[PDB]
């Protein structure tokens, strides 16, 4: 029962102490392609770059660079692609990546506008009849239907490869009430969203990895993937107490820098993994409590 290490830290009050330790121990690999000059305009922030060893490559002969990272959690047996909020000029690259990696879901954890700061381009069509065409990468993108909820929206999109005319369905899960450098309203809000993603099938291994992004692709994105992975391990090992959250985060940081951006996001990660273990322990009906408790209707 890792609720001990939690109450111990909250009474002790040393969350920032523990958060800073992870910054100090976290890996540090070269980001050489990210830093080339021809790629200055493909990065949203100049202190956030993918490691050369885990960066996604576009299947382009000219410039294969995009600010995205493959996070391959070997033991948990799940891969994720964490990327930045696409830029006005990288929307085509984003969906090219989605196509080439065979992803089936995109999880977006920011809003296009956040406290007056433009955190992301409008890279998916908001109206059924106004579909997007990315001519640089030969892709067409069409809203098919959408399911709006209190604090999140699920969209069904059709991505077409204009060359082969092949088409695929992509599920877009948009969390709308998660503030930059902040935390979700409650663990139930988060876990209801996470399990909505799980149930959709987007995380299945017959699909390419799910694409997860916020603004920089490290803070809210890191919290999301950390919780999902810890619950996977909890279940794989078949033992809630065994999972060391700090150790899983440092494994994830071997693949992309900066995952989890504040001490409060790390504490929420503990809170979320602690709550979710109820489901893994066999209390499958806690899931419906999360749905009721998240006010997802309104």
């Amino acid at each position: 029962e890792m609720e001990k290490e939690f109450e111990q830290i909250d009474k002790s009050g040393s969350w920032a102490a523990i958060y800073e330790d992870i910054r100090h121990e976290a890996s540090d690999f070269p980001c050489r392609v990210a830093k080339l000059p021809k790629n200055k305009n493909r990065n949203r922030y100049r202190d956030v770059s993918p490691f050369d060893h885990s960066r996604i490559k576009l299947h382009q002969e000219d410039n294969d660079y995009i600010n995205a990272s493959l996070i391959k959690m070997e033991e948990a047996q799940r891969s994720y692609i964490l990327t930045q909020g696409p830029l006005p000029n990288t929307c085509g690259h984003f969906w090219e990546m989605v196509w080439e990696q065979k992803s089936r879901g995109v999880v977006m954890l920011n809003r296009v506008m956040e406290k007056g700061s433009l955190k992301c381009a409008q890279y998916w069509p908001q109206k059924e009849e106004k579909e997007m065409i990315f001519e640089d990468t030969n892709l067409k993108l069409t809203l098919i239907s959408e399911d709006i909820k209190s604090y999140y929206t699920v969209r069904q999109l059709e991505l077409e490869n204009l060359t082969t005319q092949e088409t695929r369905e992509i599920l877009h899960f948009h969390y709308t009430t998660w503030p930059a450098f902040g935390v979700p309203e409650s663990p139930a809000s988060f876990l209801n969203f996470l399990f909505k993603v799980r149930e959709s099938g987007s995380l299945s291994p017959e699909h390419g990895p799910v694409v997860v992004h916020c603004s920089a692709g490290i803070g809210r994105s890191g919290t999301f993937c950390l919780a999902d992975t810890c619950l996977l391990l909890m279940d794989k090992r078949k033992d809630p107490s065994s999972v060391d959250i700090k150790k899983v985060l440092l494994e994830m940081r071997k693949f992309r820098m900066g995952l989890i951006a504040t001490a409060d996001q790390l504490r929420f990660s503990y809170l979320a993994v602690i709550e979710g273990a109820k489901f893994i322990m066999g209390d499958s009906s806690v899931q419906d409590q999360w749905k009721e408790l998240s006010h997802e209707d309104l």
Binding site: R46, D47, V48, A216, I218
Partner: peptide
């Protein structure tokens, strides 16, 4: 245009 910095993160931190």
């Amino acid at each position: 245009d910095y993160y931190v």
